[PDB]
Structure formats: C-alpha cells, structure tokens
Amino acid sequence: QKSYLKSKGVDLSYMTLQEIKEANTGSKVFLKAKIKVLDAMEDIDLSIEI
Amino acid sequence: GLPSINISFKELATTVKERSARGIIAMVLKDAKALGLNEIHEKEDIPVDLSAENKEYINLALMGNVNTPNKLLVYVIEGEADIQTALDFLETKEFNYLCMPKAVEADKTAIKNWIIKLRDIDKVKVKAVLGKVVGNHEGIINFTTEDVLVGEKKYSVDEFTSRVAGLIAGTPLSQSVTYTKLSDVVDIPKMTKVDAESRVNKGELILIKEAGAIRIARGVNSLTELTAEKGEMFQKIKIVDTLDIIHSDIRKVIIDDYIGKVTNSYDNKCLLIVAIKSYLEELEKSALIESDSTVEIDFEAQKSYLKSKGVDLSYMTLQEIKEANTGSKVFLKAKIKVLDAMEDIDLSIEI
Amino acid sequence: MPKAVEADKTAIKNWIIKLRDIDKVKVKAVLGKVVGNHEGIINFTTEDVL
Structure with a gap:
C-alpha cells in the first residue's frame, strides 16, 4: 500500500x-498473510532406558 | 490490461549473518605429481598427487583438538618457486592459517616478511x-621442540x-590452547621446567608433560619484546585472534556499505x-569479549579534520x-574491552 | 504420455511450467x-519393472 501511494505521488x-x-x-488491492503447513510421519526416533 | 493478478506466496529463508570466515587453513605444499591446488574441503579425501608424507600431513591437519578445521586449502607445485606461487595464491584468496611443510629458513623468513607486509x-x-x-612479530608463531615423538614415529618440526x-x-x-593434552603424541624429549619457563618468557611454544599427559606450554605469540602499547594480552594468540x-x-562490512x-x-x-x-552488541553477545566501551566520533580526530578544513x-x-x-574522510575512536580466558586460579581455604 | 519421446516430454514440461508460472x-x-x-513434473527412473 505504501508503494502504491508512492507511485501515486x-x-x-x-x-x-x-x-x-x-x-x-x-482498483488495486494489497494483502499480507502467512500459513502453517502440516506434514506426514516419515522419521521416528526413540531411546529406551533400562 | 485486465489485470489477471497473480496470487503467490513468498519463498522464505532464515536470516544468517555472513561475516568474514575464520578458522580456514591455507597450506601450500610442494610435489612433483599433478601440480595444482587440491582444495581439500571434504574430509578424508586424499588426491594421489600428495605423497605419503603429504598424506600424513593431511591426516594430522584434518583432525583437531576440539573441532575439525573449517576449510583446508592444499596446493601442489614443484619444489622450485614455492614462495612465488604461494604468495600469489595467498594474495588471490584470503586465509586464517598458513604453514609451509617444506619451508627452508630463508623461505620461512620470506613468508614472515610478506605476512607482516600484508598486515601493515x-x-x-x-x-x-x-x-x-x-x-x-606477533602473528608469526614459533614452535621450538625438536625430535617430537608422535605414535612412535620420527616427526619433523614442520x-x-x-x-x-x-x-x-x-x-x-x-577455548584456549592452554594445557591442551595430545593423546597421539607418545613422548617428548626430557627437559627441565625452568627451561620451559625460560622458553615461555622468550615466547616460543613447546610441549610439556603435565598431569600425566603431553600438553601445550602456552598460547603466547612468537614476538619477543612487546611494546608498552601492546601489553601482555597482545602476546596471547587467542586474545589477538x-x-x-x-x-x-x-x-x-564498511567496504560493503559505506565506500561510494x-x-x-x-x-x-x-x-x-x-x-x-550494533556490531559491538553482537560481539558482546558472542561472549568472546565483554566490550563495555562504545565507539564514538573521535573529537580529537574531529578537531584534526576541522584543522585540515581550517x-x-x-x-x-x-x-x-x-x-x-x-x-570524504571518516574518523572513529576505537576503544573496547577484551576478555581473557581462565588460566590460573587462587583461593585460600581456611581451618 | 506412454509414447512421448524425450523431445515430447521436454515440450510437456515446458508447457506445464509455463502454465504454472x-x-x-x-x-x-x-x-x-x-x-x-521443476517440481510440477514428476520423474520415475525405474526400469525393468516386473
């Protein structure tokens, strides 16, 4: 939006x-977002304690 | 026209600072096989050009006390004109450590003179x-211990x-090199502790059999007589590092940002x-030095430049x-606090 | 495409990336x-499959 205003003078x-x-x-529209993407199980690590 | 406007995410990355690299080793070497630099940045990689002694050199250099060296630079050329090509390639590419396995005393002197010329x-x-x-000189490092016995094998000083x-x-x-024990070294020539103290006062680095192990004598520079402005902290290679x-x-960063x-x-x-x-805050958070002092425009240098402008x-x-x-001139005042490693400790417990 | 030649596969990839971009x-x-x-195309390099 700041860039648009600057371009408008x-x-x-x-x-x-x-x-x-x-x-x-x-006519222009400006927006900002951010998302978090879930993943799948492919690596599993465990430690046993005696 | 008719904006068919695009709907895209922004490909993100994590911010990482990229200051001057440290811990790199530039080791120029001589051989008659496959002349040229080997750039051995991968570990346990031995080009066939380097001989058995050079292979042992690689094996010694690759492993370290605490960490592996960041990058190892190896060059190969004929024994003639080692100094010229070494100087040219060290001018071409920056370095943090330099060592010539086949340096003669004249070659060592030439290396030291070129090093101090660059530092000036x-x-x-x-x-x-x-x-x-x-x-x-302080940057150059001297190790005066002959007949070093590592793993039951004759080893040159180089x-x-x-x-x-x-x-x-x-x-x-x-970490400091102080009292760094070497498991690989099996034996060192017997020598008196008074001799070790004398050599430390000279500044030469040697080996000591302490705590039932062969350890590093000191981290002091090879420079003999430090001036008053330098002080004893400048004798420590760790402190000057x-x-x-x-x-x-x-x-x-100044060349990157300010010139032009x-x-x-x-x-x-x-x-x-x-x-x-901000850079001083970065150094303080690095905890290598305390750095309480602040850098400001030197009003003495400011007065000097006003005098120059009249x-x-x-x-x-x-x-x-x-x-x-x-x-176009820039004047700054440099004052900082340099932190030292713990080497000697006293207390007086009481009954 | 079962019978796309490598030129045909290259054309397919170029068209797909052109659309995606x-x-x-x-x-x-x-x-x-x-x-x-490119990631839109998928490569499966396994031959002599029984």
Whole structure:
C-alpha cells in the first residue's frame, strides 16, 4: 500500500498509520498473510532406558 | 490490461549473518605429481598427487583438538618457486592459517616478511605457524621442540607445526590452547621446567608433560619484546585472534556499505555510529569479549579534520564542531574491552 | 504420455511450467526419464519393472 501511494505521488508523511492502511487503493488491492503447513510421519526416533 | 493478478506466496529463508570466515587453513605444499591446488574441503579425501608424507600431513591437519578445521586449502607445485606461487595464491584468496611443510629458513623468513607486509598494508592481522622463527612479530608463531615423538614415529618440526595448525583451527574461540593434552603424541624429549619457563618468557611454544599427559606450554605469540602499547594480552594468540576477526569483519562490512554508496554526512555519521554499536552488541553477545566501551566520533580526530578544513575552534559550538563537514574522510575512536580466558586460579581455604 | 519421446516430454514440461508460472494453473505430470529442474513434473527412473 505504501508503494502504491508512492507511485501515486502522494507524500507519505502527515497522515496516520491507520489512515495509511485504510487509504484508498483504487482498483488495486494489497494483502499480507502467512500459513502453517502440516506434514506426514516419515522419521521416528526413540531411546529406551533400562 | 485486465489485470489477471497473480496470487503467490513468498519463498522464505532464515536470516544468517555472513561475516568474514575464520578458522580456514591455507597450506601450500610442494610435489612433483599433478601440480595444482587440491582444495581439500571434504574430509578424508586424499588426491594421489600428495605423497605419503603429504598424506600424513593431511591426516594430522584434518583432525583437531576440539573441532575439525573449517576449510583446508592444499596446493601442489614443484619444489622450485614455492614462495612465488604461494604468495600469489595467498594474495588471490584470503586465509586464517598458513604453514609451509617444506619451508627452508630463508623461505620461512620470506613468508614472515610478506605476512607482516600484508598486515601493515591490508591492516588485517594474520597468523603463521613455522618450525623455527626467532622473529619479533606477533602473528608469526614459533614452535621450538625438536625430535617430537608422535605414535612412535620420527616427526619433523614442520610436520607437528602443521598438526598444531589444524589443532588451533579446530579450537573454538571460547577455548584456549592452554594445557591442551595430545593423546597421539607418545613422548617428548626430557627437559627441565625452568627451561620451559625460560622458553615461555622468550615466547616460543613447546610441549610439556603435565598431569600425566603431553600438553601445550602456552598460547603466547612468537614476538619477543612487546611494546608498552601492546601489553601482555597482545602476546596471547587467542586474545589477538578475536581482534583480527573483529577488524576483518569491520573492514569488510564498511567496504560493503559505506565506500561510494553513501556520501559522508552528519546523519550518515550517526547511522555509522549506530551500526558500529550494533556490531559491538553482537560481539558482546558472542561472549568472546565483554566490550563495555562504545565507539564514538573521535573529537580529537574531529578537531584534526576541522584543522585540515581550517574551520576555527572558537565561536562554534562543541556539537557544531562535531557535526561539521567531514568530506570524504571518516574518523572513529576505537576503544573496547577484551576478555581473557581462565588460566590460573587462587583461593585460600581456611581451618 | 506412454509414447512421448524425450523431445515430447521436454515440450510437456515446458508447457506445464509455463502454465504454472504465467497462467497460474497448478497441475502435475509424471514422466519416465526427465532431468527437469521443476517440481510440477514428476520423474520415475525405474526400469525393468516386473
């Protein structure tokens, strides 16, 4: 969103960070995510104690 | 147009710092078979060019006291013009340890002179282990113990110094070579403890039979008479090792970041100070040195550069003098705290 | 493709990676002997299978 605003020529300063987040993006839309991927069992290690 | 906009994840990686490498061994060697460098970075790999004695050299160098040396560099050329090609290839590629198995005394002297020339010019202090050097330099290392008996076999001084090179490379920075017992060594020539003390005062490294084992006498430099500015801590190769690593990392990162890329300015000076402070915090967290002191703009060097620019000392504020133009020149004040390893302990228990 | 020649297999791999990189069509293919440097294609180098 900051890059879009810079490309639009708008000076980034003198506005709220929340305002920056909620600023109009035109037709463009920008988002950020992150996911956690589960795996399968392929290696098993155990130690026996006498 | 009609943005058919893409929906992709970002391929992620873990951040890793990549400061100047340490513990590498550059060992140039001579042979008449398959002349050329062997770059033996994989362990227990013996190219057929290197002879049986060279094979034993590899076996000694590969194994260390605590760890395996990070990387072993082996070169092969004819016995003639060893020094020229060694100098050229060591200039081509950086190193942390240097040892010539077949160095003559003249070759050892030439190696020492070239090493000190680089340390004066490149400003990066390096180390070199040699069989018998009486030189007054700290980076060079001398081991004055002949007829070393390792596993019931005749060993030249060069062979065991090459072994010690890998031993030191495998030594972690938190650990010192002090009282490092060698299981492989079976016997050393008998010698008085007073002689050992005298040799330590000279700075020569030798072997001692202590605690029922053959151990390292000292980690002191081969330099004989340290100047007043250096002090006894500079005699320790372990202590100077972290200084050399710090200088190498600092110069490398400065070349990476500051030369040309950023024009020098007061804000740039503040950013450089912040980066240096971050580096000092990194060193402190490394726990190799304590490093309580902080690096700041040397106002004495600042005054020197204002004198060079000719700006008056008077009528301008201390801060104003400090924040004045620095041109292309950069001035810093280096003060740190260097931490030492525990070697001798006293208490007085009481009844 | 049971009877794809190595040229045909290479063309298949190139088309598949082209879709996966531009058309964003995430599809997978399996081939017998392909040293391709992509994950969408699948290589199974086992011969004389009984």
